[PDB]
């Protein structure tokens, strides 16, 4: 039963370096899912959201990150946006289940969290599931620069700001994607 270190973990990583954990050789319970309902979004593609413990797959790959509440719709097949074209892009034939719930009593601090970075500019769109951890300068302008971070030389990882005194559009949602495969 390896669904106990994926959801209730201490600190998820950022959205750009989205952590992965492999699940194998144990049929999961799916008891906290679709029977506890403390989560916000359960937008679950392909397979029915109610029949999970009956079915069996080949590989169960889980991954996780933390995104703003106005960007919870971007974790989707092909729905373009800001994080779904530079940080983490699902493919168009992805089957699996997407999980999201609120996290403001854990991930927010008075004065900004300043440690949940997200990637702003990249030279092209992302491929499906391709992740990049490098912090190379985008150099939007004509000139190249040697990491000097000047005019049109950005740090591509913009830092989130997280305070408990905000709305729902600016609150970090702990979002975990489940990816399954048949053969």
């Amino acid at each position, epitope marked *: 039963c390896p669904f106990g270190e994926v959801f209730n973990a201490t600190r998820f990583a950022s959205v750009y370096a989205w952590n992965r954990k492999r699940i194998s050789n144990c049929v999961a319970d799916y008891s906290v899912l679709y029977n506890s309902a403390s989560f916000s979004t359960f937008k679950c593609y392909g397979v029915s959201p109610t029949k999970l413990n009956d079915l069996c797959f080949t590989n169960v790959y889980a991954d996780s990150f933390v995104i703003r509440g106005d960007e919870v719709r971007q974790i989707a097949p092909g729905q373009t946006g800001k994080i779904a074209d530079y940080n983490y892009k699902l493919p168009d034939d992805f089957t699996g289940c997407v999980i999201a719930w609120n996290s403001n009593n854990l991930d927010s601090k008075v004065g900004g969290n300043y440690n949940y970075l997200y990637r702003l500019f990249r030279k092209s769109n992302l491929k499906p599931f391709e992740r990049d951890i490098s912090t190379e300068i985008y*150099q*939007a*302008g*004509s*000139t*190249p*620069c040697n990491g000097v971070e*000047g*005019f*049109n030389c950005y740090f591509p990882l913009q830092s989130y700001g997280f305070q408990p005194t905000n709305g729902v559009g600016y609150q970090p949602y702990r979002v975990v994607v489940l990816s399954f495969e048949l053969l």
Partner: antibody
Amino acid sequence: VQLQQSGPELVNPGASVKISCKTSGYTFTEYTMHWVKQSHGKSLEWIGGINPNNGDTIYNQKFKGKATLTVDKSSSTAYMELRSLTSEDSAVFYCAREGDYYVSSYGYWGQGTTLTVSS
Amino acid sequence: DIVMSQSPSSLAVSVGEKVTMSCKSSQSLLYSSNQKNYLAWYQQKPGQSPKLLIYWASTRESGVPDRFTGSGSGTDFTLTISSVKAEDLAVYYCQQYYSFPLTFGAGTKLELK
């Protein structure tokens, strides 16, 4: 794309003047602008540039304080503000774009705004 | 500052001759990552508004048919036109655009008679 300036100006010494660079045909917040100063036939200097996405400016050390660059985003029109003109700023002014991709710092230039100092 | 200059100041060439143009940079404007030079050339008549016709480094731009060619690397650079035409009678500038004080000088067109 075609990029139009304003008409010729005749400015008294020591005055604030706004030069208009009106452009269309493309999304304005995607490429930068620049401003250079052709001193009656020898394009030796550059005034500065301004990114429409962030409003960030950077000027040459030759024109510090006497040159300011401010561009609004909605009207798709660039503006350069020259304050305290003297007898050294007798030239023509072109506004520039930055290529078709980020390949060249100049391209698709405009007409010539001829600003002489009218004492 | 980064300063460049044209050692040919005067051309004095009629219709249909082999010409060269040269500029010498102060420091190297070779971006070491992509291995690209960063120079540019553009033409202007003494009346009109100039227009760029050379890309990243000595390459060409879709427009006027590219009889001209430029080359070079590092500090010394070339620009050559095989035959002088009616559209070649214009002053050409050598522009550096690697380090951010974007200074550039002039190299003047003249005619022989």
